[model samples]
Target: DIYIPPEGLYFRLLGFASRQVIFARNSPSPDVGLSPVNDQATDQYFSLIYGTGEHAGLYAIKSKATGKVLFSRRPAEPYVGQIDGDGRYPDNWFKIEPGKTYLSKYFRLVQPSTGTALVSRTHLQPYFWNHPQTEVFDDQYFTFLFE
Candidate 1:
């Protein structure tokens, strides 16, 4: 599926097969979660704002729950990058890369610095995978159909 670049639109990033929504931990700490239930709470929705300055037209993923942005903590371990929540600076923003299409909407939310893609393992633990070998897997790429 083709994503119509929903710039400035609020939506939820739901896992393709996991059926969990990308969620912000309902707190001020820099943590995120994925919820199975669609609460329609502020934590479950995010606004993809058009980036500015050095980022130019890229999009910044901002959470409506905590009002913080998502970022990769820039880990060097084996596929264990920490995805944190915080300010809207260089680390917290990313460009949405369109992925291979077959049926549903797929996207690779990539970190600009390390080129790691946002990935999910279980329902609640969302991390980044450095140099992912696969593209269309449920844990690698995400679907935006929940919006």
Candidate 2:
């Protein structure tokens, strides 16, 4: 899960909190789904397409089949959006940073001004939880185990 950032590499992301694979059905919702487990979700595999954002290091999470990009449309939601497209600025850009501790190949999805991503299990949504001056990895902590 050590992110090398070799863009366009097809991989599966295992949610550290939900314990599920980040995915969307071949059909509707247009939103990212996380129900199936990692090994069982082959179609769930996605890619981190680099560039087209505010910087070069940022990435746009791309769908393998539909070729759609992920967008932070709402603070409590992220859905399959424009294909190879850009969503304003930080909405489509993402950075995989090291996790809270030296446990495993852990990391967290972060952005410029929107703050780090925090998957809320209770609300069934993933949103950017903007912190104060301090940068803490509590709810934002997660891992991306690429396959």
Candidate 3:
């Protein structure tokens, strides 16, 4: 089993499809896309803020540098992605569902309400799961790491 550890631990997410770490751009207020890892460049570290009260054991993905949280876009545009916000609602939180034991250390970061799974199939940004809805392919698996 993949142990998520306790809350407040910072880590990086390496997407299987892109084979790169996940990152957000530096700025917030405008709240841009969750970008692909810029190789050795910074802005990649992140923390999982554990949920409480109404929502428990879930997480909010926050930037280690910018302090912005990953939040969903409008429901109509369901196949979209993360940004900055107060992160109070369920849209901002993710249920980090682990892959099978053979694919251990990997997880599916999915939004609770919209069932949006984070994916990065290209260079631009990480997007919500679309196309083959029922199945989650490699593009949606992210290897969790602390280094």
List lDDT for all candidates, in order. Answer: 0.60, 0.56, 0.66
Q: List the RMSD of every prediction in angstroms.
A: 4.2, 4.2, 3.5
| Candidate 1 vs. true structure, TM-score | 0.71
Instruction: Kindly indicate the candidate among 2 and 3 with the higher lDDT.
Output: 3
> Which residue pairs collide, candidate 3?
none
lDDT per residue (tens digit) for residues 20-58 in model 1 = 777776565434656664576667777776767777756
Candidate 2, 1-147: lDDT as tens digits: 575547667876665555666664566664455655635565576777776535577777777766766654335433323444533445677677766445356666665555545342324444322332136544445555554
Global Cα lDDT for candidate 2: 0.56
Model 1 residue 22 CA deviation (Å) reads 0.8
lDDT score, residue 126, model 2?
41
Off by over 4 Å in 2: 73-89, 102-104, 116-139
The superposed Cα distance between candidate 2 and the true structure at residue 78, in angstroms, equals 6.5
- The parts of candidate 1 lying over 4 Å away from their true place are 4-8, 28-30, 76-87, 123-137
Per-residue error (Å), model 3, residue 143 = 1.4
What TM-score goes with each of the models?
Answer: 0.71, 0.68, 0.76
- Ranking according to TM-score, highest score first: 3, 1, 2
C-alpha lDDT of residue 91 in model 3: 77
Ranking by lDDT: 3, 1, 2
Cα lDDT tens digits, model 3, 11-58, are 778776776776655555334433455553456777878888766877
